[PDB]
RNA sequence: AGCAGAGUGGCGCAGCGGAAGCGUGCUGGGCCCAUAACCCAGAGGUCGAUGGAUCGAAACCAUCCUCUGCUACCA
């Protein structure tokens, strides 16, 4: 099961609904630095992000999850974390 | 945050002092057993909004909106 996790880590994406906090924006484009609070599910590395109300356009692929400049891999519900999201290569970068 | 570019028929696009167009798509007819191709028509336009220099702005200048890119400036 360790090897199954190791070669199925990219193909397995945990579900996550995320609520955005106002005015906690640092970088708007390349990369995306935005201090966003978990409200449902959990956040892991490589999890894509999209918007439901704008005909499902992807935001990008995340890089790291930081809780007060400390890298925590798994964040549960109810914690304010900082996520570094990078644009996917082959598609145009996005702005806040 | 700031800058640059663009806005014309459903779509893309020509287009500037005396001047609402093209390609494609939609509708009708001819041709044919039938279709494509082709022919004949027709429908579809706040030329992004505002002001002004103008006899004569779809056009030049100023502002603004929307859309498309960026110089990087964080835990």
Count of helices and strands (H, E) across chain A: 1, 7
Q: Which residues touch strand B (CB under 7 A)?
A: A 24, 26-30, 33, 35, 66, 68-69, 82, 92, 95
CA nearest to A96, candidates A16, A19, A18, A26:
A26
- Report how far residue A39's alpha carbon sits from residue A34's, in angstroms, rounded to the nearest whole number: 15
CB burial string A20-47: b at 16+ within 10 A, e below: eeeeeeeeeeebbbbbbebeeeebbeeb
Domains and CATH numbers, chain A: 16-96 (2.40.30.10)
By 3-state DSSP, what share of chain A in percent is helix, strand and coil, each rounded to 5? 10, 40, 50
Report resolution (Å) to 1 decimal. 3.9
Q: Report the run of H or E that residue A16 belongs to, with start and end.
A: strand A16-19
- Å from the A82 CA to the B24 C1': 49
Q: Please provide residue A25's backbone torsions phi and psi, each rounded to the nearest 5 degrees.
A: -110, 135
**Distances in whole angstroms, Cα of residue A53 to Cα of each of A11, A41, A66:** 25, 20, 27
């Amino acid at each position: 099961k360790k090897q199954k996790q190791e070669e199925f880590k990219h193909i397995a994406v945990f579900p996550c609904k995320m609520k955005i906090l106002p005015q906690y924006i640092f970088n708007s484009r390349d990369p995306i630095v935005m201090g966003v609070t978990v409200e449902a599910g959990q956040v892991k590395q490589g999890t894509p992000m999209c918007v439901p109300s704008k005909n499902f356009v992807d935001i990008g692929i995340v890089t790291s999850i930081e809780v007060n400049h400390k890298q925590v891999d798994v964040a549960k519900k109810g914690q304010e974390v900082c996520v570094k999201i990078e644009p996917i290569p082959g598609e145009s970068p996005k702005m806040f």
